[PDB]
Design a protein around this ligand. Structure first.
Ligand SMILES: *[C@@H]1O[C@H](CO)[C@@H](O)[C@H](O)[C@H]1NC(C)=O
Ligand SMILES: *[C@@H]1O[C@H](CO)[C@@H](O)[C@H](O)[C@H]1NC(C)=O
Lengths: 303, 183, 111
């Protein structure tokens, strides 16, 4: 019932914001104290007996946590007194924040990040990207920087309950506003291009058999098959949910291969085939990133 | 008076589940009532008035709101006032997808375009395998469609086409054949 | 977690949880017990979500978890069979459940 004591804040790693408090001085000895905590506008409510709460949030906005004490875990039980402690983003020049900061995990091997300079940016500023995940001993500074045009970037290695990777872009001079980015280990994944093993015909049906990347299994991937014809000037495209090997007559016996059949295709003309691969919502969090197209494989009568 | 064949129910995984059985000759619409309810808690029974197949044969149409794989339905075939047959039914185990439609032929290349009979909300909206039969009778060539877009493009090398669907993962039976299109 | 789930049943539940998180607060900020271990979460998730009364959006999800749990589940069973760690919003509950299923789908425990 009374207010909690010593509701303070701290920042571990890069984006780990931790609220910690102490039990109320006014106390009922006949009470199992549960703490009702929520953020702005009744967001992310949680009732827990712990005197601490930590979340992973990009510190780009001032967010506050309200803390109330309870004796019951019921919904009807609403604390009369709540203490709120807020935390603001680090100091820096108004429009110095780097824009369009994105990070893509390439084939579960390396993370490549890119961003654009802020509107209010000094010409002599030097960008520095820092990353961190649970497995690391401390905050690491990505040194493999790159510059693709007007874009600034940095790519670091990253090999494979819910844990994510924190990314901070900040100048060591401490003149510009540090920008943050949280990347879940199950999202922003761009696989490698697959490898076509064989193309086989059955009347007017074309069986395409390829191989997925080594770090990805069959059921975790959404497929796209491209079939370009020379004579008919056709640029067909097929989207496949899942592709399994059905007819062994027109397929190799490699057990890591997926198979798709394209109907209404003639050997009379030359047919070029490419395969593109992305992750589905069944195994990963995002299905927006396609891999690069596979190498071309042709079949049929040449011109 | 006595149930000869036990009710064989099939579902289209959306709102409807067709049950069918065989009885001597009787009036199922008058005497027989099919009571069905979901095993899910807060049980609410439902009464079905079965239509007649013909010659000691009746067919009942069960109505649902949504269908998930875990759904299990207990069946109670009430003969007048006395229970004739008791059993259960699982829609996901015996799925029969509803037939596709709106098939239109063609024209640079011969093209066929039909429609997905399921709404985007449904689960089969992305898990339906099609099969187009194009004949003139043994001149037919069957095509298998396992990609998303319900399109079929072939070359020209007096015909009639038809389309049916099949859900791969649920190991269903083939859907009924769509109304053919002559050209 | 529980009995070996069919591939279709997992893919369906996963797809449903994703469909829910696409919008307005889920179940108007109703709160349920969170899950600690994946040793028996298939019944723990159901025993937790069953305490939600007036939410229609979670109804399809609740009906799916019934096939993943061997025994029968009624309202108010979580406290006795599982450790009460913390209560969270249904939205957070679904996201955590979705993550556990997606992890299970990669490991391929189904069937
Ligand atoms: C459905 O529930 C009944 C009773 O609860 C049970 O006997 C049956 O095995 C379940 N499954 C099917 C497929 O009927
Ligand atoms: C098409 O798929 C069905 C169902 O698996 C199969 O029985 C049939 O042989 C297939 N036909 C062709 C030409 O691929």
């Amino acid at each position: 019932q009374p207010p909690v004591t010593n509701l303070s804040v701290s920042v571990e790693n890069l984006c780990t914001v931790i609220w910690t408090w102490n039990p109320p001085e006014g106390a009922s000895s006949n009470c199992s104290l549960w703490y009702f905590s929520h953020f702005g506008d009744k967001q992310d409510k949680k009732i827990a007996p712990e005197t601490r709460r930590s979340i992973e949030v990009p510190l780009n906005e001032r967010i506050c946590l309200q803390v109330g004490s309870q004796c019951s875990t019921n919904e009807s039980e609403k604390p009369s007194i709540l203490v709120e402690k807020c935390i603001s983003p680090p100091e820096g020049d108004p429009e110095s924040a780097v824009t369009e900061l994105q990070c893509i995990w390439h084939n579960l091997s390396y993370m490549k990040c890119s961003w654009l300079p802020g509107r209010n940016t000094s010409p002599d500023t030097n960008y520095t990207l820092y990353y961190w995940h649970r497995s690391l001993e401390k905050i690491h500074q990505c040194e493999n920087i790159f510059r693709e045009g007007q874009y600034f970037g940095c790519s670091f290695d990253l090999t494979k309950e819910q844990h994510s990777v924190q990314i901070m872009v900040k100048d060591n001079a401490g003149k510009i506003k540090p920008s943050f980015n949280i990347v879940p280990l199950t999202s922003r994944v761009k696989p490698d291009p697959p490898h076509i093993k064989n193309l086989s015909f059955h009347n007017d049906d074309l069986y395409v058999q390829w191989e997925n990347p080594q770090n990805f299994i069959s059921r975790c991937l959404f497929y796209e098959v491209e079939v370009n014809n020379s004579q008919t000037e056709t640029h067909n495209v097929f989207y496949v949910q899942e592709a399994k090997c059905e007819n062994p007559e027109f397929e190799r016996n490699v057990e890591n291969t997926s198979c798709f059949m394209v109907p209404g295709v003639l050997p009379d003309t030359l047919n070029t085939v490419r395969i593109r691969v992305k992750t589905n919502k069944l195994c990963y969090e995002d299905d927006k990133l396609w891999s690069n197209w596979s190498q071309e494989m042709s079949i049929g009568k040449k011109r | 008076m006595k149930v000869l064949q036990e009710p064989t129910c099939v579902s289209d995984y959306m709102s409807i589940s067709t049950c069918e059985w065989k009885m001597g000759p009787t009036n199922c619409s008058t005497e027989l009532r099919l009571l069905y309810q979901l095993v899910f808690l807060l049980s609410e029974a439902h009464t079905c008035i079965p239509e007649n197949n013909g010659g000691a044969g009746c067919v009942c149409h069960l109505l649902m709101d949504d269908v998930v794989s875990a759904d299990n339905y207990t069946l109670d075939l009430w003969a007048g006032q006395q229970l004739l047959w008791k059993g259960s039914f699982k829609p996901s185990e015996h799925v029969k997808p509803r037939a596709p439609g709106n098939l239109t032929v063609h024209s640079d290349t011969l093209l066929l375009t039909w429609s997905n009979p399921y709404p985007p909300d449904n689960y089969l909206y992305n898990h339906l395998t099609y099969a187009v039969n194009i004949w003139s009778p043994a001149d037919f060539r069957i095509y298998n469609v396992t990609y998303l877009e319900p399109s079929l493009r072939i070359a020209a090398s007096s015909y009639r086409a038809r389309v049916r669907a099949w859900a791969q993962c649920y190991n269903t039976t083939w859907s009924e054949w769509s109304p053919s299109t002559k050209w | 977690p529980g009995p070996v789930p069919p591939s279709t049943a997992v893919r369906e539940l996963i797809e449903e949880l994703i469909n829910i998180t696409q919008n307005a607060p889920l179940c108007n900020g109703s709160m349920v017990w969170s899950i600690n271990r994946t040793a028996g979460m298939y019944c723990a998730a159901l025993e937790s979500l069953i305490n939600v009364s007036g939410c229609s959006a979670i109804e399809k999800t609740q009906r799916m978890l019934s096939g993943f749990c061997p025994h029968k589940v009624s309202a108010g069973q979580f406290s006795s069979l599982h450790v009460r760690s913390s209560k969270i919003e249904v939205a957070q509950f679904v996201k955590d459940l979705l993550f556990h299923l997606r992890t299970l789908f990669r490991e391929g425990q189904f069937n």
